[model samples]
Target: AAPGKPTIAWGNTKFAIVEVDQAATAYNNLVKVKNAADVSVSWNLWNGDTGTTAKVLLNGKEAWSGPSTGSSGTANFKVNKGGRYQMQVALCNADGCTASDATEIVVADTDGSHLAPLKEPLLEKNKPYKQNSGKVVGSYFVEWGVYGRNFTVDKIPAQNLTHLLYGFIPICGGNGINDSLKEIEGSFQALQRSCQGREDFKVSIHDPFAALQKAQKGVTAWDDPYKGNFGQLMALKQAHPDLKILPSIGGWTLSDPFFFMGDKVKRDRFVGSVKEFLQTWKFFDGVDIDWEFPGGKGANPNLGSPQDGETYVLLMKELRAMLDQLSVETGRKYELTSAISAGKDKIDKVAYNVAQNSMDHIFLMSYDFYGAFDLKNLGHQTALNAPAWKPDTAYTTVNGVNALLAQGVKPGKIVVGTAMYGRGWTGVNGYQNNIPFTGTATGPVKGTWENGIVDYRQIAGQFMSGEWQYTYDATAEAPYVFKPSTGDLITFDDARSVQAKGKYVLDKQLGGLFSWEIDADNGDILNSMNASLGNSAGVQ
Candidate 1:
C-alpha cells in the first residue's frame, strides 16, 4: 500500500510495469509452418524490475516462459493442427503483472510434398537474327478463348497481325503435345461458321493432316500433327497461306517439361518431335518455344534446373540445327523463335547469342510486371516508360527492351509484348497516381475470369465511366483511372499509350510488338500498333 500500482500503466514508470499500449505482434502475421516446425513468436516487454519475466500463451495457455533480459523477446511453439488461434504475451515483476491483447495467429498446412529446392540463375548465349524486312507485329491466340470467353478465331484480326502464335499446346506424354485438338478444332469450326455467314471475315482453317502423316509420322502417339492443335492449325494454314502459324509450346501449365529439355537426350527427342510434327503437317511455319522461361523459376519451378541457363542454349542450338536440316530437305526455311522473359535478371541469364544466331525472333513478354503480387501500391502492368516517382527500376516496357538490346539482341529481332487486358486494385487509397503503399488494397477486384485482371474491353465499358477520372502519366506513357470516393484504381494501356509504345518501337527500331492476346483487345490497341509500327498483315 506504500505505492499503489496504476490500474493500467500509461507513461513511464520507475517500478515494474508493462507497456499495455504496445500490443504483442507476430512477424509475417500468419504462422506458416509444417507439422514438425514450430512457429516463432516475438514480443516487446517493458521490464521495470531486474527480475521481470515474460511468458507467451497460445490459446490462453502458457506455452513458453523465460527471464526477460532486454526490451524485446521471442518464443517458439510447435503447432499440432492448422486453425485460427490467438497468442498473448504476459509480463510479470514484483508489481502486478499485465497481459497484452491476444494477437490473432493463423496456422496453415505445410506438407513436405509441396516443398521444392530453389533454382539457380541461368547463363546462356544468343545471337540476334538478321534485320527483319518489315515490322514484326504478332499476337497470341489462346486456345481457351473459344469457350468461356467466347472469343473465337473469327474474332482474330489476322489482317493486322504478322505472326499468330497459337497458345498453348501443353507438353504431355514425354515431349508430346497435349490433347488440345478438340478445343482447337472447335475454334476453327466456329470461325468457319462465322466466315460462311460473313464474307468479309476470312478466317483461316488448317487442312486435315492425317493424310500427310507419312511425311509427318509423329515420333510418339501424342506427337501427331493431326491429333492435337497442330492439325487444326494446319487447316488454318490451308485457308490463309500467308498466315504464319507458330505452335507455341509450354504456357503457364505445361512449362515444367522445359526442365527436361535441358538434358541432351530429352532435348533431342523434343527437337525431333517438333521437326516431325511440323514437317508432317507442313502447315505450321515455325515453333515458338514458349517454355515460360528457361531458368528454374516460372509457372512450374520443377520444370527448371540449375543448368537451365546453359541447357536452354543447347536446346535452342539443337532445335535450330533440326529446323535448319528440315529447311534443307523441304527447301524452305523453318522459323525458330522463343517467348523470352522480361525481368532484368532473367534477361541476363539467357544466352542472347542463341537468340541472335539461331532464333528468328525473340518475343519479350513485357507485361505482368505488377499486379496482385504487389499490394503496396497500384502500378502499370505495361508502361511504355517509367514515371518520375517510379518505385521499381525495371518494370517498364522500355527497360525490358533496352535490357535485351543491351545484351546485343538485334532491334529488328526483339519483339516487345503488350497486354490486351488491364490490372486493377480495389479500394485504392488517396488520389490517382499519387497513392502510396497505404492506398493499395489486398486481394483482387471483381473480374470475369480472374480476380484482379479484366479484359480491356470490360474495363473500357464498365470501369471507365465518367465517375472515375482518367489520369495519363506522360513519363510512364500509360493511362489509369481513379475514383476517390470508392478508392478504386484501374491501370490499363489505351490507344494513346499503345501508340506511344509503337512510336518507341519505331524510334528504337526494336523488332515490333506482340499482345499477350488478340482477343482481350477492344480493337484499338492492335490497330494502334499496326498504324505506328508500319506493319500490314502477311508482309515480310
Candidate 2:
C-alpha cells in the first residue's frame, strides 16, 4: 500500500514510555497574585479517586467560582481588578471535569512598579529540564522540499536547529492554486502571490519565485533585492544566531481562510495582515497559526464551527496582542506558534485552555498517529506504546499525551511532533506481535511524493539499508520494516526512535523536539533529536 511501517521482534519486546500524571500536575498548578491579592491555589492528585475544582476569569467574565475544600485541587481568589486573568484548574472523578490549562494573570495596576511584568503564557515556568535546557528545536520547512525532495535551504541542520517552521504562507481567500513553486531547468511552475486586491485574511509569499526569486547563497546581494527561500533563510538566520525563522501560517492546503480568519469581520484584517507580513518579511521571527483544525476535522471537511473554539480563543488573543505590540516596536522577539492537535477530539475542539494564553510555543502535533489512511489498523505509526494488542487503543503516544495534558496543555508548553516520513502498507503478512492480523492492507506504498509515504531518507537509503527487514521495537521506542519479498510494512521514526523521542523530551519536562519534516530528515532524525536534547553537536 503506501507510506507505512511497524512489525517485528514480537516477544514482549521492551517498548516503554507512557504516563498519566494528572494532566501534568494540572498544568503545573498555576496561580499567582497581587492587585487585590489573596490567591491560594494548590494541586497534585492522581491515580484513581476524587475531588478538585476552581475557576476565576477576569476580562473574560466569571470572576470566581467554587469547589475544593478537601479531596485535592484547591482554590481561593480576590484579585479585585486586573486587566487579564485566567487561573483555572480541575480534576474530578465521577466522569467529568476537563478544565485544564490556565494560569495567566496580569494584575499589576500598582502592585506593579512602572509596569513591566506579564511573562506567564507558561514559559520555562515549570523549569526542571535540568540540563536539556530551554528547548526549542523546531522544524517543518516543507517549502515543497525544493521540488521532489532534494531539500535545500542549505540542507538545514543549522548546528542543531532551534526553530525554522516555515511550511506554508498562503491566506488571501484560499484555494486558488498557487502552491508556491518555481524550478526551471528541472521544471516545477506556479508562482503567483497576488490574491487580487488582497486583504481577505491576508498573508503572502505567492512564491515570489519560491520566495524572493531563487538562487540562494549568503543572505543575498548580487545587488540585493531578492534571492530564494528568503535568501537561504537569510543565510540561515545569518548562520544560526540561535536559529528562529517562523512563517508557518495556514498549512494543510492553506487552512481554508481559518473559517473566515476567526471572524470579527475578518479579525482586524487578519491582525493587520500579520503586521504587514512581519514588517515585510524581515527574515521573519514569528507567526505560525497552521490551523489544521479549529473545531472540525478540517481540510474542508465541512469548514469548521462550534464557534470555531471561541473563534480560536479570539484569534490567539488578538494574535498575542499583535505580537506583543510588534515586540515593543521592533526590538524583535515576536514568536507566537500554534500547530496543535494530537487527537482526543483534537483535545476538545482546540481550546488548549484558552489557546495557551496566546502561545509562544505549543506546536504539539506529535506525529500523524496512523497513516496511509488506514483501511485497517496497522501498528506503530509513531507509537510510544499501546500495541500490547491494543491495550485499549486510544492511539498511543501515551494516548495523545494523556489527552493533551488533559486539555490545559503545558509541560513546558509542548512541542513533541515527529515523523520524517515512513508509513507504508500493502498486502502485509505475518509476524504476529500486536496483531491486527500482522498487516493486511491491499494498497498504498509508493512514496517520496505521496501515497502511503516514505522518506526518512528513503527509509534510510531504501528500506533500512537492505530493502526491508530492520526491527528495533524495544517496546515502542519504535521502528519497523518487513518485506519477506512482498508482504510489506513500514512504520517509522528511527535513530532509536529519535533517541527515545529525545528521552521523551527530557523525561516529560517537554516543549522541544519537532519534525513533520525538515525534508523527511536525511540527517538521522534531527541527529537523534539533537543528541537526546542535550545537543552534543553534529552536522554543523
Candidate 3:
C-alpha cells in the first residue's frame, strides 16, 4: 500500500492531520485565526527572540506572538480584533532571522474574500538577448600563410576582440609547431591577459593531414614535419583550459582531397581519420572543416563535384553526433564548424544549409570578396545590404545571409567575416598618396598573392611614401588613395563605414564578426567593432 493510502480502514483522512489542544478557550480562539487551518493548530511557546519565539504585528499593533523552532510545520498566535490584518513569518538560521514577505489574514471576518488576492505588478524579466541590449561580438584573426609565430599573442592586438578565433594552427607544423611554453610564452601571456582568462578566445589548430593522405604510406606528418601534434595540444589545454582550441581541418592546400572524399569508401576513410585524430587528441573541442568550397572547392583541383554538398553535410552530422556522445562521457562539449566561401556564385550554387544544420556555425568568408586579381576597377570584399553601389542587384554579405536563411539557417548561426587588412593595387600612374585614383591606372605587381594584395605592414609603408591623398567612397563604403606620380589603388576601412557594417550585423542578428587576422591592422580594429556595436540597442 502507498503511504497515503490504507489497505483496510475507514478513509477519514484524520491520519494526515496533526492537532494541538489547549485547555484555555483564549488559546483555542487564537489558533483558529492562524494560517490556512481547517481544524487544529500546534505550536511551541517562546520567551523572546532568544528562546524559539516569533512575533507578528498588524495595523501597528502586536496581534499574535509565539515560539517556533521550524522542526514542526504548524504555529499558533493570539489576536483580539476581527478586521483584516497583515502578518509576517520568519525562520532563524544559525546566522539570524530571515526577513520575507508577510502573509495576510482576517482577525474578525469583515467581508467575503480573504486578503484581496494582491495584484502582483507585472515585473519585466531581464533578458540580455533582447534587441537594443547591445553586446560587442568580434572574431580574432590569428595568422595567415607562412607568417607563423610572427609575434607573441599578447603583443598582438588581441585585447580588442571579444571572440578570439586564433587565425590558424598551421597544418604544416605538427610536432614542429613548438607548443613549448617558452616558444609561445608571449602568445599565451597575451592570450591570458586578453581573452583566454575569460574563455573567450577560440583557437583553431590546423592538424597535419598529409600523414593521413591516402597517397602516403608508412608516413605521418603528425609527429614529424608537423612537430607539435595533437599530443602537444594537451599541454596547451592543461596550461589554459579556458582557451577553446579546435582542430581546423582543411585549408587552401589541404582541401585538395577534401571534396574527392565524396565517395562512400573515401568518405568513410576520411571520417575514420578524423575520429582517430580526435580520439588521440582528447583536448581539442571539435573540428572546424575549412573545405573552402565544396562544389567548386578551393585552389585544389584534385578534390571536387556536385556530390560535395551532400557528402560534406553528412560528414558534419556524423561528427556532431559523435562529439555529442563524447561530451556526455567526458563532460566536454565538442563543436563543429566550417568556413564557407563568400563568392556570390559559390554561395548561391552550393547547399550551405548542409553545413549550417550540421555544424555550430558557418563562417562566411566575407573577406576576399574583392581581390586585386579581380579585373574590376573598384570593388569591395563585402557590400552593405541593398548596396547603393549596385542598385538592383545584391552583394556578398546580404545575399550570402539570404541564401543561408532561405535554407533555414538561423542568422545567429552565421559568422560574418571581415579582414583586418586591405587589398589594393600599387605602381599606378597619375595618383598622389594613392588616396584617390581618378586617372587610368597601371596593374599591380604580378607575383603577389593577388594584384595589390599586401598586408598592413606594406600599406603603412605606402602611407609614408607621400605620393597620394586619401578619400572614402560612400557608395562602396571603402577608403582609397590616388597619386599623380603613379596610379595606385589603396583600399581600407575608416571608422564611419565600419560602424555602418556593424549596424548591419546587429540588424541581421548575426553570430558575430570575424577578421582575417588582427596583426594586419595598424591600431585596434577591435575598438571599432566595440563602438559600432554600441550604437545598436543592448550593446555595452
Candidate 4:
C-alpha cells in the first residue's frame, strides 16, 4: 500500500558509507614519482576476524602485500608502472577477512598531457514523477556544515519547495540530547528562511543519531529526548500540521549496528526502543532508518548477520503492528521507512529481501555510487537522479528496481534519492590521474574518509565567482571543474542533474523524489527542483 504521508519519508534517511580496504586506481598515465613521500591510499576496511590477511595489487599485479594490520594504510607502493595502474586489496586469513571492491590508482604525467579532456554532456531531463507512484515531492539540502554557517530557515525561499530536510545532524556541542533538541528546534526557527512566505513549505528532520545517542542516554526514549521540546515542534505544527517531524534513526556513526542487530532479539530491541520513543513523542509522523548497511562494516560498531534479511522484515512487521495499535488509540496513522544501501550486494542481501513488503518506502541512496571514490571514471559520474543510459541490468536502477519487484516491492513504493552535492578529487594534476599537481598522496585525494566531498554551495560559489570552471559529464550525468590555475578539484550537482533525477522518479513510476538535505543546496538549486516538480504539465 502507498504510504499516505506529506513528502516521501523512507528515502531521506541519511548515512555515510565509510571504512573499507582502500584501492586507488590510477588511469591513463605512465607518470612516475621520484622518492614518493607517501603515496598512501587509505580506506576503513572492516576486517571481521583478528588474524585477517590483506594484499595490495598494483596494475593487476601484487605490488605490496601483508596480512590485515587492523586499520593501517600499508599499501604505499612506488609508481613503477607509469601507465594506468590500479589498486586491489584483498582481506583474508585463517578465519577469512572482509572483502573489498576494487579501488583505482590513476598514474599521471607532470603536465597532465595524458589526461582525458572533459566531454560536456547534456543533463537529460529526469522523467516526471508519476501521479500515483506514491512519491509526493523532493528537495536537497546543501548542508550547513560544508558552508561553515547556519542559514536562516526564512532565508530558504519555498517558491517551489514541496518538502525539506535541513542541513544535517547537529554536533550536539558536547551538551546532551537537550542541546541537540534545542539546536534542531533553533534550525526550525530559522525555517522562516524558506517556509515563511510559502504556504506549502513541508518539512522533515534528518540528523546524526550517533551524536543524538551520545547527547542523551536514550535519545530515542520517546518520552523526553526532546527535553520538552516536543511542545515546540507541536507548536510549529499547530501552524503547519503538514510539518512531518521524523526522528531519523541512522547515520554514519550509528549505522554499523544494522549488521550487529541481525538476530531476532537484537532487532526486536531496536524496534522496541523506537516504538517506545514514538509513543512518547506524539508529534512525529513517521520514522526513517539510516542503517549505513546490513552486510557492510564500519567505524565504532560492526556486525553482519546471515539472517540480516529476515531481521529487518521482522522488525518492520513489529513496527507496523505497533503503529497500528497506536493509530487505534490516537486515531492517526504512523509512518515507517528506511534509507537502503545502493550497491547490489547490500540490497539483494538485506533490504530488498527484508523490507520490501514490510515498510512504506525504500529510499535508494544512489548518488554516492560514482563519487571520487569510484575505481572507473566513466567520464563523469552519472547523475544520481537520471535514467539508466544502458540496460546492463546487473546493478543499475533497473536492476535495483527489478530486485525489489522480484521481492514484491512495488515501484510506486520506491523513492530514488538524488544528491545536491558532489564528491571531488583534489591534488590531481588533472581529472584522470591521481598524481597531485604538487604533493604526494599522504592521505585521500581530498576527504578524510571519502574523497572530493563538498556541497554545491562551496564549489558553485567558486564557479559563480569565476574561481572555478564548470564542465559537464554526460556519460556520468555529473559536472565538475578543475581550476588549472589553483589545481582545485570541484565536483557539484546543478539544476540539470536534479531534473534528471526527478525524471527518473517519473519514468520508473516509482515513489517520489527525496534529496539528502535542504541546506546542502543553494536557493537557486532548491527553486529549480521545486519548479521542475511543480510543472506537472511537462512531467505527466
Candidate 5:
C-alpha cells in the first residue's frame, strides 16, 4: 500500500512581504510542525504560515529524510533561497511514496536571522473624513443579556458587524482554597478576581446555561450539547462566516489574575490553556485581552506595578507566537486584540509600540472618560473633542486617538470605541446656553441597568418621545439628553456623534468602530455606526 502523505505543520505562506517579520504574519519566518512518529517521512521547507505549508516546486530539495521517532519530532530546517515557496511532505513505506499539495510562502534570505521589522502601510495622513470611513463594526455580546435584557443571539444585528466579542470569561486560579470566585453569573459588576497561578489559570464560561446548556430556537437541537447562546452563536457564524467572534478575558472586576501573566511559566500556562479553550469552544476565533490597566489601579490595587508595562508586551508577543503555531495546526488564522485605556497616563503605562507588532487590532476604551463617578463636573463621557474650557485636561475620543498615535502606534490598527449607554447624576441645575455643556449634579441618577447607567435604547426612546430635551455640544461633538422634569442629564453617542466617530476612523483610516455591549443599543446606535462603516443595518 502507498504511504500516507506527510504534513508540514507550520512555517506557512504570506505575501510580497520584505525581510524579517513578526512570527504571526511573516511568511518565511520561524515555523514549526509535527507529524505522527510512525510514518516514514521526508521534509521540504517552505514559506507561509498555515493550512497548506508549501507551494509546489518542480525541483524539491530534501529538508529531512528518514524520520521515525517518538510521538512527534520538530524541525528548524528550510532552504536557503526564498521566494514563493511552499513546503512539500513525502511519505514513503515498503509499498511506495506519496506527496501532498502546498500553499504559498515568501522568503528573501536564509540563515534564519534575516528577520527585519515588519511594517504595515498606514492610511494616507491628514485626509478629509468621509461619511463612511470606518471599515470594521463590532460590539460585545453579554452572557447575562439572556436574562434581564432578554437579548438573544438571533436578535443581534450581525449584518452590520464585522466582529462580535463575547465578554467576559473569568480566569480561574489564586489560592487553591478559595470557596468560590464571588462572580454572580448575571450581574454586571464582576467585583472579584480569585484566580491566579498557571495551573489553575484558565478562562471559564461565565454561565454554562447561557453558553451551551439552555435551549435556543433555530439553533439548539434536542439532543445537542451545544444548546444555549453558544449554539445560537454557532448558527450565527454558520450564516455569516465572515463574522469573527472572540472571547474577551478580564474586565474591571476580573483583571487581578492578569498579574500572573507576567511570570514566564504562568504566561506559558495561560497561553496553553487559551489554546485549549479556543479549540474546545470552536465558536471563538480569537481572544480579546481586557486587562483594564496594567500599571494603573483599576478594580484591584494588588495587581499593577511598574513592571506590568514590559510584562504586558511580553504577554502579547507570546500570545502571537502561540496563536501562530495554532494557525498552522488548525489551518486557520487567529487574531490577537486588546481592549485598551483612553487615559493618556494609562496609555503611557504600557509599551504599545512593542505590543503593536503582535496585535491585529486595539479596541480603544475612549468612552467612560467621565461618568456618574463624578460628583461635581458634568461632561460628555464619549466626546469626540475635548471640553472647550479645559481642552488640555479633559479626556475625549480625539485625545485618546492622538495619544495612541503619539506612542508610534499605527492609526490603522486602532479601533475607536462607541458607548451604547449613558451616565448621569440625579440633582442637576439648569444649564445656561451660555454655559453650553456644563452643569452640577448632586449624586448618582437612577438607572435601569445600575444606579448611574442607562442603556442607549431607553435614552433614544425618551429623547425621541420628547420626554427629554436634547442638546448637542457642537464644539465637543457629543450629544446630551436632559430630563427636564428631574434635571438628570445623560451624555452619550447618538447618530450624529456616532457619525462623527465614523468620520474620524475613516479620515485616520483607523481599524474600525466597536461598542462595549451590543445589548444596550437600540437600532439608532447600530444603524448609525453601520452606515458610517459603509454597511446597512438592515432596518434602514
Candidate 6:
C-alpha cells in the first residue's frame, strides 16, 4: 500500500482493519520565489468529509481559502518581504472544524543565500558502447499547435516518429491532469473552418465525410474523444498503430504543480490520477514527467525546492512500480521516461541511481543551451560541444551527456535531443556568430508562428533564396545563418549537423536521438537521422 511494497490476498470479500483517525487539518511548508509575485504553500486534511472548507493563514492571518474537495491542496500567496513566515491551515467539515499546526518558513531573496553552491568534481570518461538495439526516433507535438499554428494530429507524420510526446498536458491540482477545452474555444471555429478550407487540410483533419457518417451512427471519433488536441491525438493513433504517444506534463509554463508532488499524499494522488488518465485515454502508451528540475531551479523561480532532487527520484520510483503493475494487467510494457534539463548544474542535483533503474529512458533536452534569456552574444543553441574559442562554457550536448553518465547512467539509456527550430536575434553588432556582448536585438528573426524563433521549414526557404548566409562551425559541430543587412544571427541544426549528431549517438553507443518538434522540420533533419541510424524511414 505504501510506495514500494505490494500487497495481495486471496479472498472473495476484502476484510481489513481500517485505521480511524480524527478529522483534522495540517499545513505543510511554503516556498517563496525571490522577487516574485507569490509564495507557494501546501496543506493536508486527514479523515475529513466532503464539503470541507480549507483556509491558509500567513503570519497568523487568513491569507486564502477554498472548498477542500481532496486530501491536500496548494495555493499561491503574495508575500512582500523576507522574514519568518508562519503558515497555518484550518479546516471545517460536517463533524467540526480544526486548526493545523503552523509551519515556519524562512523566506529569502534570490541572492544565492537560499540556493546551494555547486562543487566541482573530477569528471570521468564516458563508457562508450556499440549500437546494440533499435534506435528510438522521437518527436514532440505541442498542444497549442492545433490552434494558431494550425498543426493537427492527423497531420502528424506518425510514420516518421517512433514516439510522439504530446507537448504539455498540464498538471491539475495535486494529482490530476488538465484536460479542458476552455483555452481553445476561441480558435475552435478557426480550426473547424481551416479543416474545410483545402484538400490537404481536410486530409490532415481526418475523414471529414466519415466523421459526418459516424455522427449519423452516433459514433463521432472527432467529437467523441477528449476535447482539444487530445481528441485529435486519439484520431491519429487510430490511423497509425506503431506510433507511441506519451502525454508530456509540464513545460516553460504550467510547471507549478510539479512542486506539489514532493508531498507523499499528493504524490500518491498523482499516481492514482495517472492510472485513470491512461485507462481513459487508451492511446497513451505512458507518461513523461517533464518537471524542469528537482532542485530549486526551473523556468519558474517560485516552483523548485532544495529537496526536489530526492523527491523527484522517489516519485519516479513510485511511478515505475505503478507502471509495472499496469503492465502486468495490460499484457504490455508501459514505458516511463523524463524530459530532463541539460544544464550541468541541474544534472548534479538528480539522483541518477534511481533514474538509471526506474526510467526506460532519459531524454536529454540538449537544446536551448543559450537563448534570448540572456543575449550577451549570439552563440550556438544546440552545439555538439562547446566552441573552440569559448572553452569556458560547459553548455553543450557532450557536457550534458557526460555529466549524466558520470552519475552512473547507462549510455544506451540516454536519448540526446536536438531542436527542429532556430533561436535568433536582431541588431547588427557583429558580422558572424562571435559577438558575445553585442548590443541587444529587438527580438527573434521573425518567426512564422512565434517571435524570437522560426521553424526549420522557414529557415530552409531562406537558405534556398540565399537571403541568409549559412555558415557551419566545424569545431562546434553545428550550423548558423547570418543576415548581413538586418544583422540577424540564427543558430540551428541542419541535415549535416544532425547527421553528425546521429553519428555521435552511434559512435558513443547512446540511446538514439530526438527533436524538440516534428512540425518545425521540413523532413530533412528526420531523414538525415533515419539514414544515419539505419532506420531509413526514421521509425522502427
Top-TM-score candidate index: 5
| Residue 190 lDDT (model 6) | 32
lDDT of each: 0.61, 0.62, 0.47, 0.46, 0.67, 0.62
Q: Candidate 4, residues 57-169: lDDT per residue as tens digits?
A: 55556666665566543555555222344455555565443334555544422211112322111122222222322344554333333223443233333323334432232
Candidates ranked, most accurate by TM-score first: 5, 6, 1, 3, 4, 2
**Candidates 2 and 5 compared by TM-score, better number:** 5
* Residue-wise C-alpha lDDT for candidate 6, range 1-540, written one tens digit per residue: 111111111211111111111121110001112333245666554443423677677676877778877666766666544345556666666666566666665443321122122211212211112222388788898765655666655555566557899776544421122112124343333323323332210111221222112221112333221224543454455545556788787666545556666778768877776775575455678888887767746655545677788888988898899899998998877889899888889898887755779898889999988766656655688999777667666789999999988888889989989888888876646433454323456566676676668788788877545567777888888888777678777788988888888889999999888888877877777766666666642122
The sequence of per-residue lDDT tens digits that candidate 3 reaches over residues 371-442 is: 456544445545544334345444456777777788778888887766656666555544234333333345
Candidate 1 runs further than 4 Å off? 1-133, 173-235, 301-303, 430-433, 436-438, 536-540
Residue 107 alpha-carbon offset, candidate 2, angstroms: 11
For lDDT, candidate 1 versus 6, the one ahead is: 6
Least well predicted 10-residue stretch by lDDT in candidate 2: 13-22
Query: Candidate 4: where is the Cα deviation over 4 Å?
Result: 1-134, 138-148, 151-232, 298-302, 351-354, 372-399, 406-408, 429-451, 464-467, 485-487, 535-540
lDDT for 440 (candidate 6): 55
TM-score of each: 0.63, 0.29, 0.57, 0.56, 0.71, 0.65
Candidate 4 or 3, higher lDDT: 3
Candidate 6 ranges with C-alpha deviation above 4 Å: 1-133, 174-228, 430-443, 463-467, 537-540
Candidates 1 and 3, the one with greater lDDT: 1
Highest lDDT scorer:
5
- Give the range of the ten consecutive residues with the poorest summed lDDT in model 5: 30-39
lDDT of 5 at 79: 43
Candidate 6 yields a Cα-based lDDT of 0.62
Pairs that clash in candidate 6: 376-436, 444-452
